[PDB]
Structure 1
């Protein structure tokens, strides 16, 4: 070789990229073939110690710091003029030991997504959301549903007033300086936990419930990323995508994720890779070819982003991303994620105080990396029918319908579901197999109830 072999994830525009590679071969005579291997973030280092993986790899910047600690990635050498063409902060995302480790391609971050018919003017503050919800709850809906179960989604609030993962000392992260337990994070997590105590959100609320509920027009807001826009498009919801709400006057700080192209260390074709990435792919024509196949979202290349940001959805993605934290690339992050996943789950449930959940998370986040992975392990029926809030105040009727339709359910259980749905916005009725869930949802709906059917799994 001779040639260029590129590995890119399957949910990305892998046919557009090939069209870039087609132009490359037309100009240079070097054949570039694109491939999309299942589990390539895993399939890569099992094929990269032996030496024969791909020349260039696309994935996400947070996993590239540990790729570099394994010396498995070549140091890219862009020049002044070239670096200046991409947003400065995107370069910070691809860096380990004072040294650039990959090329930034796309930029993603959570935004506040809202339903324009339910809520023509989205709130500028988190603080005003409790009242918002009280109002909507009376109109048979709810204000907000997003994924409470995962730290990636709850962190934008927890970090707003001062939370951080690990302190940055230039080039190196300090895994002994964790920012999960300072005054800011306590304030954020207390707000979130109070949202749940005051019944404004159901504590069980996950990605699937939130997507269904927002897309059905049952909740006025949700928090998600560009990857989710397609599904709302399909649905009948006129939606907006805006800046995330402030908390204590400070912007939310979502984690930033950079789609990144790194060059393999055991590749003879390093200079050809550089030429491809810098001169063919990271150009307006080049990103446009990939994006025309399957949208990239916001991009690291200024010239094309300025064009794309004519879309306020993409403008909002970058405004939120610029207000966020670059997701640390080091592998200690695995401990951080466990620490904050566990604190939120425990604080929001009542098993711990906010202050003790975070006190423990500060130690767990900085803790020995193996001791923490050992811990994770120390701790059909896949279709769920979900009951939504509505204007039916006759709980007796609703309780009875659930009892009639669902075989298992007692009257008391049926009633408690009814109360939980109307109180929090949503409640689980049952989880069985696709056939049963469909019969039941269909039946519950015919009786005037407002239901979703959900998979997850």
Structure 2
């Protein structure tokens, strides 16, 4: 492989305590003579899948648990195997956070939740509601202060307001992944409130992490919204601060997405046993977690013994209070796509580039794109291969899925007829005989669909070849390969054609384009 044997490379995000982590690395090095290198690459959560897909990158990757499902789904992570005794050392619900398709795919480290951080000298009694913040800002502006500044470039920080009055990502009721609440009335109310803060000069659409942090730590703004990792810098600034429950919106609690900081092991690492040793017997201990925490606070750690100490901290009690009012992030593979969609929506709404209504509409479509495409393509491939339709209800957004499939059947019939010779030739050239061969199609399909003008014609041709291949797989008693084929084609489609698909209003555009 490309990853070096007999050493550890560890990537962690730039806002975390990577110097403290490096100290843990140093102790491991001292014991074993094996080098540990910690890096905090820019755009880490995008850089990791890029390099890991080529079999490269770090042995150990740190991020909140939400990204790890996509990584696991892409074959980038080793299954991890803590023995029973080690597992019992961490809270069961943190392990739940790192389970994907019934397998553990990461070590959970700490539970992160946003809180309201406030300056006790400017604001001894922080607002219980978002609604009183405009008036508070007007008072403070008379003194050359502002009420509130927080990062407007990452949706994570605005989500708690979006979800307060009813917005949600993927319906969690004891998951309906088809049920997406990104553009419902509650989500629009929350984002509209944020946009009005900006229009009324109570916030600035350009504000990012660095700018908000600096304004709070310099005592220019009375409040910020941030996580435990930020407390270290505030301590240094000597601002007299407090950490408390987020304001309510429309009488409802703000609901932060709760993240579990987690460490995965690169599927292509030759050092998996070393990584296991490092994570289990050096990092996930009282002294290991302490060393990181003293650099930048981790939040509420997954390790029972050490959390029992940290829980006495009023800042941590506050973190857990907010965490309990929020929801643990899903780790389904399309979480990245969801975050990309909401990110664009908040940025576009805040800048006036789009209205709130249209911005969230696009985020809705972007977030729904994977599951809806998979439903359409899976159903088409399966019915094409068996000759009979699936009579199960389509579920949520059923009209769209049903009409798209009806359109695909009609248009797809002609494409397959006209491409029969081409399809037969390409099938024989590719030699698809089993689930292993199916795995090899992804790189091929990506290369083809990363170039050229996009249109519905070319998309239908791909799905039609999918159906052709599915029929073949059925015929040679490899009917079990059809669903991973459908998943792979869907994955290539929504990845390479994301922006174009959203601009078409997803499959609704497809239906309209081939209307009769």
TM above 0.5: yes
Aligned to 1:16: 23
Provide the C-alpha distance between the structure 1 equivalents of 2:335 and 2:284, rounded to a whole number of angstroms: 29
Residues 374-396 of structure 1, C-alpha deviation per residue, up to 9 Å, x if partnerless? 6899xxxxxxxxxxxxxxxxxxx
- 1:103 paired with 2:107, answer yes
- Distance in 1 between residues matched to 2:157 and 2:47, nearest whole Å: 27
The alpha-carbon deviation at position 221 of structure 1 amounts to: 0.7
The whole-number CA distance in structure 2 between the counterparts of 1:348 and 1:50 is 37
Query: Which stretch shifts more, 155-164 or 228-237?
Result: 228-237
Name 2:228's counterpart in structure 1: 226
The 1-side partners of 2:83 and 2:364 are apart by 39
Within-5 A mapping of 1:285-304: 285-292=287-294, 295-304=297-306
Secondary structure of the equivalent of 1:241? strand
Are 1:7 and 2:10 matched, yes or no? yes
Match of 1:437 in 2: none
1:336–1:44: structure 2 CA closer, same or farther, 3 Å change rule?
closer
Please give the alpha-carbon distance, in whole angstroms, between the structure 1 residues aligned to 2:64 and 2:113.
13
Out of 95-104 and 136-145, give the one that drifted further.
Answer: 136-145
Distance 1:183 1:20, change over 3 A: farther
Is residue 73–residue 333 contact of structure 2 (8 Å, CA) maintained in 1? no
> Matches of residues 20-419 of structure 1 in structure 2 within 5 Å?
20-21=27-28, 25=31, 31-37=33-39, 39=41, 48=52, 55-78=59-82, 82-168=86-172, 174=177, 176-266=178-268, 270=272, 273-292=275-294, 295-367=297-369, 368-372=494-498
> Are residues 169 and 79 of structure 1, via their aligned partners in 2, closer, same or farther at CA, if it must alter by over 3 Å?
farther
In structure 2, runs of 5+ residues without a counterpart are 370-493, 504-516
Looking at structure 2, the residues matched to 335 and 43 of structure 1 have their Cα atoms a distance apart, in angstroms, of 15
Q: Distance in 1 between matches of 2:200 and 2:53?
A: 53
- CA-to-aligned-CA distance 1:23-65 (integer Å, 9 cap, x gap): 8x4xxxx554311245366675676567676554434423322
Question: Against the structure 1 CA distance between its residues 248 and 330, is the aligned structure 2 distance closer, same or farther, given a 3 Å change threshold?
Answer: same
With normalisation by structure 2, the TM-score equals 0.63
Deviation of 1:243 (Å): 1.9
8 A contact 1:16–1:291 mirrored in 2: no
Question: How far apart in 2 are the matches of 1:268 and 1:338?
Answer: 32
Q: CA 1:248 to 1:84, structure 2 compared with 1: closer, same or farther past 3 Å?
A: farther
- DSSP 3-state at the match of 1:36: strand
Q: Which has the higher strand share?
A: 1
> How far apart, in 2, do the equivalents of 1:80 and 1:163 lie?
38
Deviation at 1:153, TM superposition (A): 1.5
Residue 230 of structure 1: how far off its partner (Å) = 3.0
Residue pairs, 1:414-425, within 5 angstroms:
none
Residue pair 2:11, 2:40 contacting (<8 A) in 1 also: no
Distance 2:127 2:143 in 1: 18
TM-score, normalised to structure 1's length? 0.70
Normalized per residue, the structure richer in helix is 2
Secondary structure of 2:164's counterpart equals: coil
**Aligned-residue offset at 1:72:** 2.6
Aligned residues: 370
Would you say the 8 A contact 2:229–2:296 is kept in 1?
Answer: no
- Describe the SS at the equivalent of 1:178: strand
Higher mean C-alpha deviation, range 243-252 or range 271-280:
271-280
Asked if the contact 2:59/2:269 (under 8 Å) is kept, the reply is: yes
Q: Report the equivalent of 2:511.
A: none
2:25 touches 2:37 (CA, 8 Å); kept in 1? no
Contact 2:245/2:321 (CA < 8 Å) preserved in 1?
Answer: yes
